[PDB]
């Protein structure tokens, strides 16, 4: 039930392009491995894991029907990091840096969504 829209193509070709290459992207390109990291409480706190590797694949595979779905996955990723981790943890500053770039890129997105 997926579509290609102008906003989803923008989120793929402009927003994700910028975030995927960023120096702080590496913890977020793939799901958190709570076993490997030794975080037995991770999945007790985070009930909807999300990462940029999953988002990127959904964009590539036209999984989304509408840009809001992709925006929601980005918000889940960032909030998940802020909820699980502590405010002074490095990972949170990395996530906030990525969120700043996300927001700056989204600010130039077409304001109206249309299928292509």
């Amino acid at each position: 039930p997926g579509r290609v829209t102008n906003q989803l193509q923008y989120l793929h070709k402009v927003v994700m392009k910028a975030l995927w290459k960023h120096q702080f992207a590496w913890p977020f390109r793939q799901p958190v491995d709570a076993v490997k990291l030794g975080l037995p409480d991770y999945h007790k706190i985070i009930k909807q894991p999300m990462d940029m590797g999953t988002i990127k694949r959904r964009l590539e595979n036209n999984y989304y029907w509408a840009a809001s779905e992709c925006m929601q996955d980005f918000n889940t990723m960032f909030t998940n990091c802020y909820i699980y981790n502590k405010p002074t943890d490095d990972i949170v500053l990395m996530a906030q840096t990525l969120e700043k770039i996300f927001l700056q890129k989204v600010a130039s997105m077409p304001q109206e969504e249309q299928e292509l």
């Binding site: 590496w26 913890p27 390109r29 793939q30 975080l39 502590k86 002074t88 490095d90 990395m94």
Partner: peptide, 15 residues
């Protein structure tokens, strides 16, 4: 493995 608290110690995915 990496530390969430000290994540910036690592420049790339350490696995």
């Amino acid at each position: 493995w990496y530390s969430k608290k000290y994540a910036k110690w690592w420049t790339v995915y350490p696995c």
